[PDB]
A paper describes a structure:
The core kinase cascade is modulated by adaptor proteins, SAV1 (Salvador, also known as WW45) and MOB1 (encoded by MOB1A and MOB1B in human), both of which work to promote Hippo pathway signaling. MOB1 directly binds to LATS1 and LATS2, and additionally to two related kinases, NDR1, (gene name STK38) and NDR2 (gene name STK38L) via a specialized MOB1-binding domain N-terminal to the kinase domain. Key to its function as a Hippo pathway activator is the ability of MOB1 to bind directly to MST1 and MST2 kinases. We demonstrate that autophosphorylation of MST1 and MST2 on several threonine residues provides multiple MOB1 binding sites with varying binding affinities which in turn contribute to a redundancy of MST1-MOB1 protein interactions in cells.
Peptide overlay analysis (here referred to as Far-Western) revealed that peptides bearing phosphorylated forms of T353 and T367 consistently gave the highest binding signals across the array; nonphosphorylated versions of these peptides generated little to no binding signal. MST1 T353 and T367 peptides displayed high phospho-dependent binding affinities for MOB1A, with Kds of 280 nm and 680 nm for the phosphorylated peptides, respectively, and no detectable binding for the nonphosphorylated peptides. Consistent with their P0 positional binding preferences, human MOB1 bound more tightly to the MST1 pT367 peptide than to the optimized Nud1-like phosphoserine containing peptide than did yeast Mob1, and vice versa. The observed binding modes revealed by these structures are in close agreement with the binding modes reported previously for a yeast Nud1 derived phosphopeptide in complex with human MOB1A, as well as a MST2 T378 phosphopeptide in complex with human MOB1B (see ref 21, 22). As predicted by prior mutational data, the MST1 pT353 and pT367 phosphopeptides bound to the MOB1A phospho-binding pocket first identified by Rock et al., with the phosphate of the P0 threonine directly coordinated by K153, R154 and R157. The p + 1 side chains of M354 and M368 on MST1-pT353 and MST1-pT367 peptides respectively resided in an expansive hydrophobic surface composed by A89, A92, Y93, Y95, F156 and A160 side chains on MOB1A. The p + 3 side chain of I370 in the MST1-pT367 peptide oriented toward the same hydrophobic surface. The p + 2 side chains of I355 and V369 in MST1-pT353 and MST1-pT367 peptides respectively pointed to a distinct surface composed by M87, Y95 and the aliphatic portion of the E94 side chain on MOB1A. Thus, the hydrophobic nature of the p + 1 to p + 3 binding surfaces explained the consensus preferences for hydrophobic residues at these positions.
Numbering used by the authors:
A (entry chain A), C (entry chain A): 15 to 18, 22 to 211
B (entry chain E), D (entry chain E): 5 to 9
């Protein structure tokens, strides 16, 4: 239920289709003559949508009860802070943190000084920084689902859905240098097998 | 924002 | 530029992600416990969007001049008729025919007795017939681009975009028996290699 | 709707 769009819409469909080759390191690369900021912006939006729906499938198993903290494994714990509303990181539940996190990413996506909808308006000079912060924070949603909820992911059959979207995610951030090794440490074991 | 044990 | 949706939206993202395995005969299959009509409806919409954007990239090379007829090769020629507005097939240009064709598919997509947006409303009993007619008619847009315009498809670099989307298209209609061999005859040589 | 040579 949606349909015809341009020009970043062809880019999104371009990226979605080219994954069908199964070689994700090639289909992740910047198409010839395409704006780097727009290619990352287009995929960052799609990643946000994908992980929003992946987490939405398991949302009944992630509660204030079974997830009092944001966790990827026992070793890693996330406390939420952004710019101003919350400066010092605050300890909260995994459902509430992801709500903070996804509502925050939406706010950047709806900021036209950041993600301009007019096709002729340059992305800001700091756009690369803003996109790195988005993707590094969305990765943590993969990490929490994999460590805590993977059993629910297999009760539903989303495991192919999640692993294909996660493989696409890692190969994309790796191609463009979008996330530090220190941030991918929780899934590092899975990352090395992919 | 990110704490480790 | 779009974002959060349910439940057929997860289905669309589900299908888009699972292609990343490169095995398209598996990711095309009906997920366990999913409504067959809804799984075909969700992919039919995505196919429509994909081929709408693929044809939109070459739209400057397809004119009343170089394409006075709708053609897949010299052997195959299409004349447009639907239900009522045009009953007897009429000879027209390839741009005008595809405009007739895509505007027609949109009209079915916007018909809620056919593609209901409410998640609890059954698809009509004839839905399978209506979807077969859509996909068999959208295939012809692949066929015209491949035969006539493939040189333009490679001047732009859309050839991976088109071949991956076409491979996904053929494997999907083949899985669900959505198109007769007689209709795929123009691309049959390419279909046999895929 | 579909003619062949
Ligand atoms: Zn949880
Ligand atoms: Zn043409």
């Amino acid at each position: 239920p949606k349909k015809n769009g341009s020009h970043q819409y062809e880019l999104l469909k371009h990226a979605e289709a080219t994954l069908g080759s199964g070689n994700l390191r090639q289909a992740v690369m910047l198409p010839e003559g395409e704006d780097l900021n727009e290619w990352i912006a287009v995929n960052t939006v799609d990643f946000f949508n994908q992980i929003n729906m992946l987490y939405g499938t398991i949302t009944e198993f992630c509660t204030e009860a079974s997830c009092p903290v944001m966790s990827a494994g026992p070793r890693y714990e996330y406390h939420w802070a952004d710019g101003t509303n919350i400066k010092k990181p605050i300890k909260c539940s995994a459902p509430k943190y992801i709500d903070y996190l996804m509502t925050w990413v939406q706010d950047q996506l709806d900021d036209e000084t950041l993600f301009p909808s007019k096709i002729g308006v340059p992305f800001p000079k700091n756009f690369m920084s803003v996109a790195k912060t988005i993707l590094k924070r969305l990765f943590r949603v993969y990490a929490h689902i994999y460590h805590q909820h993977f059993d629910s992911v297999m009760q539903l059959q989303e495991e192919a859905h999640l692993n294909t979207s996660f493989k696409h995610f890692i190969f994309f951030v790796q191609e463009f240098n979008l996330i530090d090794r220190r941030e991918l440490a929780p899934l590092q074991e899975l990352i090395e097998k992919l | 924002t990110m704490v480790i044990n």
